[PDB]
Amino acid sequence: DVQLKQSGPGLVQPSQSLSITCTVSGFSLIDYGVHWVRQSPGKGLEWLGVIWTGGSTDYNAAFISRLTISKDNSKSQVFFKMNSLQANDTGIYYCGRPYYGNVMDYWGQGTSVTVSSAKTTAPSVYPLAPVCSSVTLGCLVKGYFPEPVTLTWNSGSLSSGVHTFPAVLQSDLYTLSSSVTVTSSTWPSQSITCNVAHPASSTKVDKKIEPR
C-alpha cells in the first residue's frame, strides 16, 4: 500500500557528502510531507528535517549548514543530501511520512551509512564442515569491507535451521558467520551450499560444504 523505498546502503568517505533518495508509493508528495530522521550509536534517534507539501523545508538547527532536502512531486521522490560527513555520522537514515504534523505513520526501510576511509575489500568465504541426531554446518565470511554481505543456503531454499550472525568489525574488516542445522541423516547425502555476495566488491561465491 503505502511504501517509502530508500536507496541502498552507502559508504562515504569522511568530509564527503551523503545522498539518499526516498521513492514513495501509495501516496503523492503533493499530499504529504516527508521527514528524515537518523539513528546513530552515539545519539539514538535524531530528527533531521522535513519537506512540506509546498516544497519548503525545516531542518534541525544542528544540521542546517550541512543538510538539504528537496523533492520532485512528478517522480514521487524525495532527496536527502548532507555534506561534510564525519565518522559519527555513521548510522541508519530514515525517511518517513507524517500523516499530519509530526506523526510519522509509515517509514522507509532505512539506509545504513558508514563514514570511513577504509578500503573496499572482498571477503574470503570458508566452508565450515563438522569435525571428523542433528548436524550443523557453517560458513565463515572473513575480511570484507564495507557492510553488507548477503548470505543464503542452497540459494535461499534452506532457511528454518539457519542462524546468520551480525558482522563483527575489527581492524577495519568485517567478519560474519552463519550456521545451518539439519537432521543428521540428510547431510552429507543431500548437498548443502553457502551462497555469499559482497556487492561493494562485486564478489559472488558458492561454497559447498564437503565432509572432512
Binding site: 574470503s124 570458508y126 565450515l128 564442515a129 569435525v131 557453517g138 558467520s177 572432512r212
Partner: peptide, 26 residues
C-alpha cells in the same frame, strides 16, 4: 545451547590463516 565447533577449513589453512568457530545456538 546446542554447541558446534569447527576447525579451520582447508581453504583458509592453505592461505596461512586459521579461524576456529563455535556456534552456540538457540
Amino acid at each position: 545451547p546446542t554447541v558446534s565447533i569447527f576447525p579451520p577449513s582447508s581453504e583458509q589453512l592453505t592461505s596461512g590463516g586459521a579461524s576456529v568457530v563455535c556456534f552456540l545456538n538457540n
